[PDB]
């Protein structure tokens, strides 16, 4: 039955039904065995589409709230509605990460990946948190990312797309959540340079490098 749920998740992916895909991969995770690389990717794709839709939707409605008398009340009440969906999605992923995925992760690769994911989903809560819980949530995100960063420096090649992906996202955390363009720029630049140094069998790495450099070129002049 673990195999059937995975096949159902793959159908949902083809069908572009992401709530279904998420539901299925949640159930796989809940059976408590370590996920394969394929199951890992299905889980992250599923929730990224689910969380992502709320994020974009939140941004658009936030933009309107600013530009809007008591019509801007309605935008605010809708924004709040979207936040509670967003927070529930993030709190689901975060529970899975603590109760199952991070403890069972037997390779550095899996650990960095799930800690990176933990960083990502606290970063999504932080984007949308009030000033009382914001700095506390920001902390959790920074810790998770930092732990992942240390493990991937000791254990993984600079060209490993999981290491580069962590670098990319951790840059973004620094730029968007904390307001440090140069701290973000450093992390991205070294990650990129370190990857160029190891060149002198994967194509996803060079794509992530291109994204790292795109963030540099944007964030400074």
């Amino acid at each position: 039955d673990k195999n059937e749920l995975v096949q159902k998740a793959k159908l949902a992916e083809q069908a572009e039904r992401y709530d279904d895909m998420a539901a299925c991969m949640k159930s796989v995770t809940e059976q408590g065995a370590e996920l394969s690389n394929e199951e890992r990717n299905l889980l992250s794709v599923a929730y990224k589409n689910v969380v992502g839709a709320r994020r974009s939707s939140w941004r658009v409605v936030s933009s309107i709230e600013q530009k809007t008398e008591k019509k801007q009340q309605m935008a605010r009440e809708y924004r709040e509605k979207i936040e509670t969906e967003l927070r529930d999605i993030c709190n689901d992923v975060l529970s899975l990460l603590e109760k199952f995925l991070i403890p069972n992760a037997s390779q550095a690769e899996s650990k960095v990946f799930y800690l990176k994911m933990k960083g990502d989903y606290y970063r999504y809560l932080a984007e949308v948190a009030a000033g009382d819980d914001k700095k506390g949530i920001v902390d959790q995100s920074q810790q998770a990312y930092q732990e992942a960063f240390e493990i991937s420096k000791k254990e993984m090649q600079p060209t490993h797309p999981i290491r580069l992906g962590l670098a990319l996202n951790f840059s973004v955390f620094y730029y968007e959540i904390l307001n440090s363009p140069e701290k973000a720029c450093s992390l991205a630049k070294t990650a990129f340079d370190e990857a160029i140094a190891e060149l002198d069998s994967y194509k996803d790495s060079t794509l992530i490098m291109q994204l790292l450099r795109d963030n540099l070129t944007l964030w400074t002049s």
């Binding site: 990224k48 589409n49 990502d120 990319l168 996202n169 973004v172 996803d204 994204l211 944007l218």
Partner: peptide, 9 residues
């Protein structure tokens, strides 16, 4: 606007 993070693929 997009957050320039890891895409899905």
């Amino acid at each position: 606007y997009r957050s320039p993070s890891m895409p899905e693929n």
